[PDB]
Amino acid sequence: LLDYEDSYVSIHSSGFRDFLLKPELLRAIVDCGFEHPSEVQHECIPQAILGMDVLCQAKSGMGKTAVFVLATLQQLXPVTGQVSVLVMCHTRELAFQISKEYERFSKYMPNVKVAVFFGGLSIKKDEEVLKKNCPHIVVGTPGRILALARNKSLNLKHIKHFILDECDKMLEQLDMRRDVQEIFRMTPHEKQVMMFSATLSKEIRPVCRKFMQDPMEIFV
Amino acid sequence: STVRPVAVLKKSLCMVKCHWKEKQDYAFACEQMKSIRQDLTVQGIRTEFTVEVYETHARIALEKGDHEEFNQCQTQLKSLYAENLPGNVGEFTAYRILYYIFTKNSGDITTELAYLTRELKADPCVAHALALRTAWALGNYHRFFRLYCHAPCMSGYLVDKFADRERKVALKAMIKTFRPALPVSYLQAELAFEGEAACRAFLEPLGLAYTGPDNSSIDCRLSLAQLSAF
Amino acid sequence: ITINQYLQQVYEAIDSRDGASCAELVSFKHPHVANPRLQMASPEEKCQQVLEPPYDEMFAAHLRCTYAVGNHDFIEAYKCQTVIVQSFLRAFQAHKEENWALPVMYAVALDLRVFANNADQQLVKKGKSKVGDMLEKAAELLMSCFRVCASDTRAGIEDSKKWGMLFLVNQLFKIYFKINKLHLCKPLIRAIDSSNLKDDYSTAQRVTYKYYVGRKAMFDSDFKQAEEYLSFAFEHCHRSSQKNKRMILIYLLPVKMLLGHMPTVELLKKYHLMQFAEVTRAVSEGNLLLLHEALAKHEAFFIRCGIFLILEKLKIITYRNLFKKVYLLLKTHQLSLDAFLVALKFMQVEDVDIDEVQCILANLIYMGHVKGYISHQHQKLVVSKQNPFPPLSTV
Amino acid sequence: DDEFEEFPAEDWAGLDEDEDAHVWEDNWDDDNVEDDFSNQLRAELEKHGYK
């Protein structure tokens, strides 16, 4: 004997109740049938509830929209005649879908009011909607939001949750990026920014995170 | 369609159980179970039938390895048990500890231990799960695979998920310790391989440069460099 | 003092922006709370000619809460305190570039936590809901306070509300550890790490944060980080607060034992932690039987603390110590794999054979505790002839 | 009721903080093998034939 010589479902046991969400929010979560949160939900909900910037790249159908829907509904202080949540996306279909999600997750919180604006409709109707019953959540395309902010029909000085859906599609263009820059400039500097999209290329990531203060970046 | 009466849902669950026994069609079984528990959760039904449905789906999701579906079922079963439901508390506490071993969640294991009663720990399934957890944390692959050989209930189905990684860790430890050669019969004995063919099938992709033309034993000194690759 | 005089004093404090005075006039640790005249049932009519909103509603709710605490019934006392927090946050968010309400926020949050605990006790007595239900609502209110404090970034350092961030983080940590939702501490830890004031906060808040984060790191099997944070927390503690130091030691002892440092019996007696004496002696001596007996005797205490898993790796250290004892007794480097079997059988370990001895020694060598190899042909373990058992600190 | 309690003062600057003089022992690991447990182990090994 010689001598020794030198994914779609989270894998964590933490349901929606473990996120310390509002009981009126947990009731809606159970009602819509969401048993267990997705991996992106488990990664982003605790960070997004605290009102901090989030950057998320996840495949469609992984509960990406519900993340920021729950995040903005949790930290919502609703006051009459004041908008505190703004959602911007490049397509009218996504805006309608996110408005429907907001409506679905707020059947136990009658105070919260959500309004939707998009192109193809008269801006006079949007101004009338804003003046008659100013909502707490506004979902819309960058062009319509920019027009409503320019013509002094929407008060952007109260925004505290400015979020983008499919940030890649908006920030790849030039007119859309200019409109987003203008709208972000009008909003207050003390707020929360979250950006969710399916495919975030490395070329758009710097110009995507340029709008956030030390965001939590997650890519799948 | 969303509102489904409990009797019809029971009939559907029984039919799905019979179909799974007859044919073992995993996609159909998972779709049926997901629809069943979706209909249960939209109505807010938390009862013995709900715990039975979740138990059945979790047991089905172990014959065909689906960690995501099993985690969903077990994390629902935890709250169902906490709501004072009979279920199989010891069995699925054992499965919970075993899944936490699979995902390496020491904090979750500690939380589970903090709420274990004497009558629960007396259960054979949870006793086996606790012994396996002790062997895994203590790095005792001999005890680990001795318990993996005869695993009560469907414990072995969970262990199979991390059996391969545990075998790789054990083989790294053995190669770092057994010199100048490591017999493949020792691998067969320790790693709980039900066949020399299966043992060699596990050993082949690593490429450990076995000694002798017949590859009777692993040459650990030559395979030391290969350790970092796998 | 009359209610009119008290409200005039509150109004003067608010007008002069006296944060300390306003906190004293709203905290429940002040003798004015014991004043029977101040405690009122419906001060809604009053406070409106004195305090501008939302301070009027906040202090009326405080008066109602004082009346409640006088007449027990902590459930509606906690409801009134929640009203106080909600009313005060709206006024705190209005203060632009002025952190003069930080003491008020501190007192309000502390009273909210205390009333949440008392209301949970009352609700457990009533049997309506499980323990820790009001902790979730208190955590929601503290999260609102934390986000209000954190969103203020453009203000100057001297007037930033970020100074009131570690206190809220610590309150949230306390709630999470009470309700075992330790997975929620990651965003707070990340926020404090990204903050530029983490080395400038108050010493008490920094110490509490370090203790809780080290405890969570130990809970996540990050032993070096846990050791560093808990060592900082133990080193910096007030002499008067001995209970806090004992709680530090409870979770610092397993990590220091794992790293190779053993607590002294003098320390254990000084901080009244005698449950670790037998464990420390067994680990030092390599006594598996004594370690098992101690872990069984203090099993309830260790399970309640949450350090049973971390203390059962002292069994890993005990294996190394016992094998070192065997090697020193035999004075031979080509040790037989049956001497370790004899030692393990003497330690009353059930179903121990040469196979399990080989497995244990292989794991020890893989982890670096033992410098050697196993022949498996002559059934002998050969050691390095130099540093066969390296120090635990180096490993 | 076992929970981290609040400190009396918000700051102490280390003047009144307790410093512990070598409460950690690191020299326990030594080649000295003489205690009662060691004697028991040696007796067991001698009984089983190992010196």
Residue numbers in the entry:
A (entry chain D): 10 to 15, 38 to 251
B (entry chain A): 571 to 800
C (entry chain B): 4 to 398
D (entry chain C): 16 to 66
From the paper:
The DEAD-box ATPase DDX39B (also known as UAP56) is a multifunctional regulator of nuclear mRNPs. TREX-2.1 is composed of three subunits, LENG8, PCID2, and DSS1, and shares the latter two subunits with the nuclear pore complex-associated TREX-2 complex. Cryo-EM structures of TREX-2.1/DDX39B and TREX-2/DDX39B identify a conserved trigger loop in the LENG8 and GANP subunit of the respective TREX-2.1 and TREX-2 complex that is critical for DDX39B regulation. DDX39B contains an N-terminal motif (NTM) and two RecA-like domains (RecA1 and RecA2) that form the ATPase core.
We used a similar photo-crosslinking approach to obtain a TREX-2.1/DDX39B complex for cryo-EM studies. A cryo-EM map of TREX-2.1/DDX39B, refined to an overall resolution of 3.28 Å, reveals that the RecA1 domain of DDX39B binds to the concave face of the V-shaped TREX-2.1 and that the RecA2 domain binds to the tip of the LENG8 leg with significant flexibility. We also obtained a set of particles that feature the best densities for the RecA1 domain of DDX39B, which yielded a cryo-EM map of the TREX-2.1/DDX39BNTM+RecA1 complex with an overall resolution of 2.97 Å. While the interaction interfaces between DDX39B and PCID2 are the same for TREX-2M and TREX-2.1, TREX-2.1 features unique interactions at the LENG8 interfaces with DDX39B. For example, the NTM-C of DDX39B in the TREX-2.1/DDX39BNTM+RecA1 complex is sandwiched between LENG8 and the RecA1 domain of DDX39B, while the NTM-C features a more extended conformation in the TREX-2M/DDX39B complex. At the RecA1 interface, a key interaction is mediated by Y624 of LENG8 and D66 of DDX39B. Structural and sequence alignments between LENG8 and GANP suggest that LENG8 contains an equivalent trigger loop (residues 559–570): a conserved YxR motif at the N-terminus as well as enriched proline residues at the C-terminus. Structural overlay of TREX-2.1/DDX39B and TREX-2M/DDX39B shows that the trigger loop in LENG8 is positioned in proximity to the nucleotide binding site of DDX39B. The LENG8 trigger loop in the TREX-2.1/DDX39B complex does not show significant electron density, suggesting its dynamic nature. The TREX-2.1/DDX39B structure captures an open conformation of DDX39B after both ADP and RNA have been released (step 4).
